[PDB]
């Protein structure tokens, strides 16, 4: 309804994005550095967790509409009850176990439980739109508020997880000059570690503090959402979604681009630290990226309004290529790194704002191709989001697995040559390859600013 709730419904988008951001950037750095797991098992954890997040979205989406309207609502008790366990199982991801055997299960189980509960919070919250009010204009305004707050929540998650963890940098042991295999298992023997273990406990306490702060924001936003908001076959669908070829072409293109950019997210969070060597201020670089993207999103809105969206995709997503090559070609420089970071932030904002506004156009084109369909309109978003998250999980798993195969050394402060070559390929070779293949498969998308017809007919 009025702003008496459209503001309360807005903050609900923050829990999913902050938790989802601080994870996506920092989790691979956590399991590899402060949790010190074997990169093979860390790859397993990342892959399985993001694949389970992708799987639990349709599961939960079906689990609703089968649950009865209780005294609290139908979609509201999900959010009311999943929040305590969500924040509990989220605190326990950033907590190192109290055991010497079964360390990987402690992270698999709790990352999967948190994915399930954050899904049981976001999917009923997402579906809460259609029950806020009966007027479509109010639902669209609430969706705009929600997306604004979600972008700002990405910003807050980055800022918090970077400034809390940045106060206690991760300690690194330089490569033993008296050793050739660079193994630490031999160097640490006969060597006191109380200082190093103390610094490691300090950074682990910083990660636990950041987890507690993010969980507190989760709890607070969930309480506001629950007190300020009071609400009032499928196989056929999957066979039909493959019969709208224009949607399929848009999906292939935007999926390749978004996959490139999430690969950038994770492996760049690691690459800034280990390859460039800015372990002390990589949080500032991540915050600069995110702030540039968030402040430049409205410019991209104006661009979409000025030119076609098919021109904005090319210009915005292609702006990243030269700077992504520059960052790996030229040596480390905190003045060049900030510039490539702000350019990559602009391009990230472009590549993530464009699909979100081009997909409703293929929805409108499908409403004209098969104009008798009831339902089968959010199945497109479901398919796109599932194949985004599943593929990003597969790619992050393969990235950490390749870092395992390159001889990633834990406790190290300078990684081997193959690890640096991989971290350079996972930011410039593979991402630029994927970006170009996406922008080349986007040439096969029919609506080329012919949306005027889809608009006037509607």
């Amino acid at each position: 309804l009025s702003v008496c709730s459209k503001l309360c419904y807005a903050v609900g988008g923050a829990p999913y994005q902050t938790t989802g951001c601080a994870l996506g950037f920092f989790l691979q750095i956590y399991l590899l550095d402060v949790a010190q797991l074997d990169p093979f098992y860390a790859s397993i954890i990342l892959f399985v967790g993001r694949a389970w997040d992708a799987i639990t979205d349709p599961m939960v989406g079906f689990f609703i509409s089968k649950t009865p309207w209780t005294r609290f609502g139908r979609l509201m008790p999900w959010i009311i009850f999943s929040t305590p366990f969500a924040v509990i199982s989220y605190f326990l991801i950033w907590f190192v176990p109290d055991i010497s055997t079964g360390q990987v299960m402690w992270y698999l189980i709790f990352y999967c439980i948190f994915q399930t509960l954050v899904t049981c919070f976001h999917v009923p919250y997402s579906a809460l739109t259609m029950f806020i009010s009966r007027e479509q204009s109010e639902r669209d305004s609430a969706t705009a508020y929600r997306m604004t707050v979600e972008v700002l929540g990405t910003v807050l998650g980055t800022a918090i997880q970077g400034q809390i963890v940045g106060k206690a940098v991760t300690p690194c042991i330089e490569n033993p000059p008296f050793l050739s295999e660079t193994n630490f298992s031999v160097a640490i023997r006969n060597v006191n570690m109380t200082h190093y273990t103390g610094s490691l406990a300090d950074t682990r306490n910083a990660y636990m503090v950041a987890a507690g702060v993010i969980g507190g924001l989760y709890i607070l936003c969930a309480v506001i959402l629950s007190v300020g908001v009071r609400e009032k076959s499928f196989f056929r669908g999957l066979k039909l979604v493959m019969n709208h070829g224009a949607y399929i072409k848009l999906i292939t293109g935007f999926l390749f681009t978004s996959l490139a950019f999430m690969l950038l997210e994770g492996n760049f969070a690691l690459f800034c630290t280990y390859t460039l060597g800015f372990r002390n201020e990589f949080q500032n670089i991540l915050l600069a990226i995110m702030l540039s993207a968030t402040l430049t999103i409205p410019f991209w809105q104006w661009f979409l309004t000025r030119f076609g969206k098919k021109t904005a995709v090319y210009v915005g997503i292609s702006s990243a290529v030269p700077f992504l090559i520059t960052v790996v070609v030229l040596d480390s420089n905190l003045v060049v790194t900030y510039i490539v970071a702000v350019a990559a932030g602009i391009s990230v904002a472009a590549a993530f704002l464009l699909p979100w506004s081009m997909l409703p156009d293929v929805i409108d084109d499908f409403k004209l191709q098969h104009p008798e369909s009831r339902g089968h309109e959010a199945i497109f978003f479901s398919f796109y989001v599932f194949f985004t998250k599943f593929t990003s999980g597969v790619s992050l798993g393969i990235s950490t697995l390749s870092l395992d195969f390159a001889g990633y050394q834990t406790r190290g402060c300078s990684q081997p040559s193959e690890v640096n070559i991989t971290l350079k390929l996972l930011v410039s070779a593979v991402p630029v390859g994927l970006i170009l293949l996406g922008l080349l498969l986007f040439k096969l998308y029919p609506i080329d600013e012919e949306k005027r017809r889809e608009n006037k007919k509607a």
Partner: antibody, heavy 129, light 110 residues
Framework: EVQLVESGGGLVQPGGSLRLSCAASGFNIYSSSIHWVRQAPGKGLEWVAY????????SYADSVKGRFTISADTSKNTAYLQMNSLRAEDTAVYYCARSLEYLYSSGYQYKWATGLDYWGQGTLVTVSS | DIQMTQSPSSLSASVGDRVTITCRAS??????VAWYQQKPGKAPKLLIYSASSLYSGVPSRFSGSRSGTDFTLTISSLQPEDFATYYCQQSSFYNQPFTFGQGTKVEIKR
């Protein structure tokens, strides 16, 4: 109890061959490191050489590089310092000393250092005609 | 090579006096110092490594400090068994030659 006993001394001719031995007890050389440090007669201590017996990493002083060669033998648990092409100024008392590798914090990095924790008794060599 | 220089080369102090011995490292940073003590005709003894870390079995009289590349060793109560020669050594693998300092002969004062 840790003990380091040196062997090999006496008079050397200028430009001769002398192998100083450092026998170890109460600890394994193959697991630990060994420094060799000479003290001239009536002068301050002067670090000579260093070896990490597991990998084989040896360092030498700028004055002894190319003349002295440090080594370790695990079959006897003994450090060795071979001295060839000796000038008539290397006459001194040589101590072998177990190292104490530790880590000092330089910001966030933990760099490696070494302290000579237990010193041998030192043996006297006189390089002179 | 790094030139470690002990600024006092002969100190005089009777029992009970606060003794201080400095050792300036030419290189600015990324170095550790190791303070040893040698009696006349006896092997040295590692007193303080890492510039502040007492060795196990060393009395608490000794105290080290890293004051901006100016490493320092202080004895709070000079017991009449501390009249020896104190050396500072460049303990760090990054600055490879672990060259010693000049020495600081402590002798009774009268």
């Amino acid at each position: 109890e840790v003990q380091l006993v040196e062997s090999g001394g006496g008079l050397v001719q200028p430009g001769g061959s002398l192998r100083l031995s450092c026998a170890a007890s109460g600890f394994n050389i193959y697991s630990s490191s060994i420094h060799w440090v000479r003290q001239a007669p009536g002068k301050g201590l002067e670090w000579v050489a260093y070896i990490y017996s597991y990998s084989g990493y040896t360092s030498y002083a700028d004055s002894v590089k190319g003349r002295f060669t440090i080594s370790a033998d695990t079959s006897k648990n003994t450090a060795y310092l071979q001295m060839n092409s000796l000038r008539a100024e290397d006459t001194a008392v040589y101590y072998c000393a177990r190292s104490l590798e530790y880590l000092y914090s330089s910001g966030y990095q933990y760099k490696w250092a070494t302290g000579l924790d237990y010193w041998g008794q030192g043996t006297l060599v006189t390089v002179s005609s | 090579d790094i030139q470690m220089t002990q600024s006092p080369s002969s100190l005089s102090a009777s029992v009970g006096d606060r003794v201080t011995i400095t050792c300036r490292a030419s290189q600015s940073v990324s170095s550790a110092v190791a303070w040893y003590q040698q009696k006349p005709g006896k092997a040295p003894k590692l007193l303080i490594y890492s510039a502040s870390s007492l060795y196990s079995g060393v009395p608490s009289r000794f105290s080290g400090s890293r004051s901006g590349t100016d490493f320092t060793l202080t004895i709070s109560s000079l017991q009449p068994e501390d009249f020896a020669t104190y050396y500072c050594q460049q303990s760090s693998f990054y600055n490879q030659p672990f060259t010693f300092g000049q020495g600081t002969k402590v002798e009774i004062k009268r």
